[PDB]
Structure 1
Amino acid sequence: SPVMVLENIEPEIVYAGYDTAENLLSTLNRLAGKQMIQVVKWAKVLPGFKNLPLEDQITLIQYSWMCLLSFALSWRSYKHTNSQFLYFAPDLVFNEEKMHQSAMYELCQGMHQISLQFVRLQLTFEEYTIMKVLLLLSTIPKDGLKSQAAFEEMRTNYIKELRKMVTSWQRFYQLTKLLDSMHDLVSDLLEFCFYTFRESHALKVEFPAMLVEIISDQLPKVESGNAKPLYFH
């Protein structure tokens, strides 16, 4: 039973341990590193995904960590603030002022825009959950994965699970359209993230060992079009 397993393994609260732009960004990076810990424990108990060679699991996670965390940022903003603010952590909610101080003001707007989508679609917890798994399987290597045959079977099943959900019948295509749009939002998130990373030493913006670990060997798997985003439309 996919749905029941998905809600149970869903990670829980996590403090960021909370003011210039550099300190604000350093904080979110540390919070990111702490959230990626919950993402790793969550994925390892994920149906299907946990049976693919460990190499595919790690790769998929590195291609999609930004998706998963920002998408969650939305669920959280949706649930705790009716999408009115950015709920990164309990001790750190963002409003236009904050979004401004992080030197991240447009990027914030885009995420807040996803949240707004949630309240408008009246997104469901059951939908959210399956959708977060699909985001995990939203980007693959340009020429395919090791166990590609297995990958597609699993991905098709979760797509089927989302279908079982919505069955008005159009809501399906609405949620999968929303999923494709996430790609656009995350591609901008990463470009800015890749830049701050490259200048971290000069900008005084702290990045956790984990994020450094991921972003580092992610760039090579992306550059020269070595990555392939999967869309529904």
Structure 2
Amino acid sequence: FLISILEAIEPEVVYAGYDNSQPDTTNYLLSSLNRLAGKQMVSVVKWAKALPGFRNLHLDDQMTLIQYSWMSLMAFSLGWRSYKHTNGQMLYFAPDLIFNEERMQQSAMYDLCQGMRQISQEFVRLQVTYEEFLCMKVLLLLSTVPKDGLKSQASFDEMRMNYIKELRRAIANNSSQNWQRFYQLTKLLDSMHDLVGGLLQFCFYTFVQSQALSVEFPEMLVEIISDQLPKVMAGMAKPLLFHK
């Protein structure tokens, strides 16, 4: 039922509104992705609010969690779309904006693009199911927290454990085979932190020099990044890992 609910609140595909008549310069590609991110942020916030348990958290905890995990959420979903639509060969940012070798090159962030493609490749290797993906995505929203704790810690812990259990349900082969899959899927979850660290570094860097580098960011993103950046830079957040 919880899983059936996740299927129901899963956001509909978001288009980039990309204009292919324009040259694919780094400035245009990055600005287009930032605009896409803004549109995706709207879907993310709406999705989170509809998530069983999220509403029970303090308003500040809700904002904090979205602020710290939006990049991981979008990168993970990108990995899923690329997996389903291109078997992990291209980055399916949006139906109207798919990154091939050429775009990855002109984006000036080829390596980060490959890091994200590696996620899709893991989905392929493990043949991640839609149910597993849905539960894992919720866990990402609940895997980067303030070092000083949350206001509704108790409720948070309970929520997190519920979705972890839901994930094991999706996984459920004998018990040892289920354990192995839990091990592998949570290894994938933990791997998101390092990738996201690199994604956020370039995001913050281009954000800080948005005007000078002519890389546009929509208001939906500017507000969030403006607040998130200092917190992250000061080392106020920490990951909730599944492995040593």
CA distance in 1, matches of 2:42, 2:229: 21
Which position in structure 2 is the counterpart of 1:7?
A: 7
1:156 aligns with 2:161: yes
TM-score (norm: length of structure 1): 0.98
- The two structures, once aligned, show a CA RMSD in angstroms of 0.8
CA distance in 1, matches of 2:233, 2:121: 32
Instruction: Kindly provide the CA deviation profile for residues 71-122 of structure 1, in whole angstroms up to 9, marking residues without a partner as x.
Output: 0101100111111100001111111211111111000000000000001100
Which position in structure 2 is the counterpart of 1:66?
A: 71
CA distance in 2, matches of 1:86, 1:184: 19
Instruction: Kindly provide the CA deviation profile for residues 130-185 of structure 1, in whole angstroms up to 9, marking residues without a partner as x.
Output: 00000000111011000111111111111111112222221111000000001110
Q: Equivalent residues in 2 for 1:74-93 (5 A)?
A: 74-93=79-98
Contact 1:17 1:31 in 2 (8 A): yes
1:49 aligns with 2:54: yes
Which consecutive residues of structure 2, in runs of 5 or more, have no partner in the other structure? 19-23
TM-score (norm: length of structure 2): 0.94
Which consecutive residues of structure 1, in runs of 5 or more, have no partner in the other structure? none
Q: Which moved more, 1:199-208 or 1:166-175?
A: 166-175
**3-state secondary structure, aligned to 1:23:** helix
Q: Which amino acid aligns with 1:69?
A: M
Q: Which amino acid aligns with 1:7?
A: E
CA distance in 2, matches of 1:27, 1:219: 21
Which position in structure 2 is the counterpart of 1:99?
A: 104
Alignment match of 1:37 (pick from 35, 42, 53): 42
Contact 1:141 1:221 in 2 (8 A): no
Identity of paired residues, percent? 75
Alignment match of 2:204 (pick from 194, 215, 219): 194
Number of corresponding residues = 233
Instruction: Kindly provide the CA deviation profile for residues 14-49 of structure 1, in whole angstroms up to 9, marking residues without a partner as x.
Output: 110112110110000000000111111111110011
Alignment match of 1:26 (pick from 28, 31, 38): 31
Which position in structure 2 is the counterpart of 1:133?
A: 138
Shift in Å, 1:213? 0.6
Q: Which amino acid aligns with 2:118?
A: Q
